[PDB]
Design a protein around this ligand. Structure first.
Ligand SMILES: CC[C@@H](Oc1cccc(CN(CCCOc2ccc(OC)cc2)c2nc3ccccc3o2)c1)C(=O)O
Ligand SMILES: CC[C@@H](Oc1cccc(CN(CCCOc2ccc(OC)cc2)c2nc3ccccc3o2)c1)C(=O)O
Lengths: 10, 255, 254
């Protein structure tokens, strides 16, 4: 899942 | 190859973390090159620095959180500069950093600590280790353990060029749960750790067995985090008044 | 300089958490209060996981811990061997890279008996049978070190002997990549001279002990090589079982 980490690593 | 890797990692570390050991050492046990750092001892000294640069306990718990969130952001950027990290499965990039960040934070947190207290508010504040001990339970148990670890770690006398390489090694760590292509990370770590050794030997000829001493602390950091993780759930459930920035609440869920 | 033995012995007692005396007492020793927790079934392993901090991988990971501690204790032990400080930095590193796992497997014998080995600072005892039991190839980690241990424990060495041996293992001029080879061979001669003189005065009964012992430094070389390969293969076979980066580095190019 991890909505925010996904966001910071794109 | 490894010529760049060390230096590329170091550049990444200088680019993304505004507080570094050199900046922090100057400010600590320095004179007043312009202004020395505002000291926070009594609760009077805390408040008189809450409009200057920003219950009493919960103001601290919230302020800690804020810099953790900034640092996780700096760490996600730092990570994307580690050669090969970008190319990993995004899912893995995320797993590595979830478990990674608070180990990386407590290592780097050592750089602003000395035996008597720690730098806060980007080097403008200095909050005394004694005042933090002073706090009502369980807020007193937050920093002290990180101090204990710091004094041992600062004892190694590392420079930012060393710390950068170590934090990379901490992040790229294929024994985190839930990784898919474990292999591509283990190779990534081998390279980072080889360089870490070679670097320590040429840069600390005085202490040739620094590399082994350092790496046995990767274990102590895991412990320190776990112990932190428990104490955070307890503060989250002790005070309904002091909850957790959703990023931190997300790195913590199931750890 | 008849104290060289004693200085090395002091260094050996100062740096290593477990030694033969501590281990012999705990093994076949009365419950001074409580005897050491036995690990047979997979239930008995788990029962001791959170007690003092998959199934096969828990073992592979746990082993790693004490290896890592011991490398560090060994780098300190090494800096107490007279003349070691003065060696070329580069050589100090080469001697210890090849040295440590030999010194580990020698000292690992001191916690072993025919039935199992002491772990977790003397509080655990994990049965040789349970370790055989493990899924291939994890069963082939410990058994060979047991085989070696039984033969080595047979020599009946005391810690004062073992200290001198481990020093002799470390200061070893036939490691690959040594520069000042000569100044090490001198350093070994001194340590090994003392080792023999010590064995003659301490074990007058067994006057073939010094030669018997020496031919074990060879078996240890083998045992390590065989270990080193088996570990790389488990690291690369199982995505589930990683290797502490220190160990992965002491193994790199060996
Ligand atoms: C929610 C619980 C929280 O715990 C901790 C525990 C330890 C460290 C942190 C993050 N941190 C502490 C500064 C905040 O401390 C004050 C104190 C007083 C103050 O006065 C206004 C302002 C700030 C920090 N500093 C750093 C400097 C360099 C590198 C990394 C650093 O990490 C948070 C967490 O888990 O995130
Ligand atoms: C990954 C491969 C790994 O192989 C080995 C192989 C043999 C020995 C070791 C190191 N060793 C740990 C054995 C117990 O390890 C546990 C600990 C707890 C436990 O409970 C779950 C089970 C096993 C040990 N060295 C000692 C030196 C002196 C005295 C005692 C010692 O003991 C590692 C390596 O290369 O590091």
């Amino acid at each position: 899942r991890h909505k925010i980490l996904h966001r910071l690593l794109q | 190859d490894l010529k760049s890797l060390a230096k590329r990692i170091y550049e990444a570390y200088l680019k993304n973390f505004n507080m570094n050991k050199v900046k922090a050492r100057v400010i600590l046990s320095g004179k007043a090159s312009n202004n020395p750092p505002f000291v926070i001892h009594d609760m009077e000294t805390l408040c008189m620095a809450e409009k200057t640069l920003v219950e009493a306990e919960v103001r601290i718990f919230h302020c800690c959180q804020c810099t953790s969130v900034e640092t996780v952001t700096e760490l996600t950027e730092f990570a994307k500069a580690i050669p090969g990290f970008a190319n990993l499965d995004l899912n893995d990039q995320v797993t590595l950093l979830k478990y990674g960040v608070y180990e990386a934070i407590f290592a780097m947190l050592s750089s602003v600590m000395n035996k008597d207290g720690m730098l806060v508010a980007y080097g403008n504040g200095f909050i005394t280790r004694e005042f933090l001990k002073s706090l009502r339970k369980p807020f007193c148990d937050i920093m002290e353990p990180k101090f204990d670890f710091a004094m041992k770690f600062n004892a190694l006398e590392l420079d930012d060029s060393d710390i950068s390489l170590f934090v990379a090694a901490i992040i790229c760590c294929g024994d985190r749960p839930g990784l898919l292509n474990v292999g591509h990370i283990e190779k990534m770590q081998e390279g980072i750790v080889h360089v870490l050794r070679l670097h320590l030997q040429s840069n600390h000829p005085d202490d040739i067995f620094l590399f082994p001493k350092l790496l046995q602390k990767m274990a102590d950091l895991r412990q320190l985090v776990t112990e932190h993780a428990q104490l955070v759930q307890i503060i989250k459930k002790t005070e309904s008044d002091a909850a957790l920035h959703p990023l931190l609440q997300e790195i913590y869920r199931d750890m």
